[model samples]
Target: DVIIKPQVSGVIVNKLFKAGDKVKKGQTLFIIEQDQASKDFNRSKALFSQSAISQKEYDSSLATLDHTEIKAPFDGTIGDALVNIGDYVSASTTELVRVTNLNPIYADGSHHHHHH
Candidate 1:
């Protein structure tokens, strides 16, 4: 069996909550500049009233286009922030921050492994 890990790719503008910092659902982790995504989203929203497309279809398009802004999938601590502001990221390609559950954090070589 292959386990898939979820990752968020974006230029981490801010690390609102850090490791060991208790977070809740919908809690902000980072702010991503989705200029391109916003443009696409605007286009999608504009076409919501198109005759050939249903509202659901338009909503789905908005969701997909908005995903350019990365967010924390679940409650976890940021392990290692790889990318900084103004960094390029993509799903299955670029990594921005490492968020792990601190309540059950895995052991590492150092207190904080060094990586950029």
Candidate 2:
């Protein structure tokens, strides 16, 4: 079992699933605020197009932009919600939810995000 934490620091705007739900890999479990991140990436795109920003910043922006949506990395039964909507979450500093997989081995692998 591992906790799914957001990669970017932001406010959690929505939670799509509940505890004890079966979720598939890449299912949308929680949603964080993305407006600013999206705008940043939008401009970052143009800046990168004009070579105004380094690839490092551009790529980092893209990565952060995506962190707004937290998804399960593997199919598993998720645990209770540790954080609620409108709660602020930080990368590696917050515990959002727990996911437990009961596969024979750690096999490598959404809406209300039911596991299919």
Candidate 3:
């Protein structure tokens, strides 16, 4: 079972793919409204290049954008949609959807040991 959750809390700006959609690894599932976050990242990017901002400050800004989107972690089929577009979601508080991998099923504790 694969659970897809957003990293940030904000209005969902876009839902690119929906339930039952086939997703590949690193595929974008949804986008959160992050105008301010984008601006901050740009500012940090500019400052960091000029050596005006410390690496810590620039890294912090980059981290802020980490929660602005949700992407698929592997190749699988998506499950039902829990939240709709424009829904207000809190950081790691909302489950957008579930991704299931039906192929390559693995057996647990089923391996046999051969003793010679």
Give me the candidate number with maximum lDDT: 2
| lDDT by residue (tens digit), candidate 1, 1-116 | 11112233444444565644544444566555443453323343444446666664444544443333344555555554565655555543554455555343233232234766
TM-score of each: 0.41, 0.59, 0.57
Ranking by TM-score: 2, 3, 1
- Model 2: per-residue Cα lDDT over 5-103, one tens digit each: 654677887888888988777788987865455442333334345665666555564544433677776777889998788887776567888778765
Query: lDDT value for candidate 1?
Result: 0.45
lDDT digits (tens) for residues 1-116 of candidate 3: 76776655778878778767788776898877543454333332343456666665545644444335577767789887777887877765677787787553332231244644
Candidate scoring better on TM-score of 2 and 3? 2
lDDT of each: 0.45, 0.67, 0.65
Model 2 TM-score relative to the real fold: 0.59
Ranking by lDDT: 2, 3, 1
Best by TM-score: 2
Where is model 2 more than 4 Å wrong at Cα? 34-67, 103-116
Worst 10 residues of 2 by lDDT: 104-113
Error of 3 at 106 (Å): 17
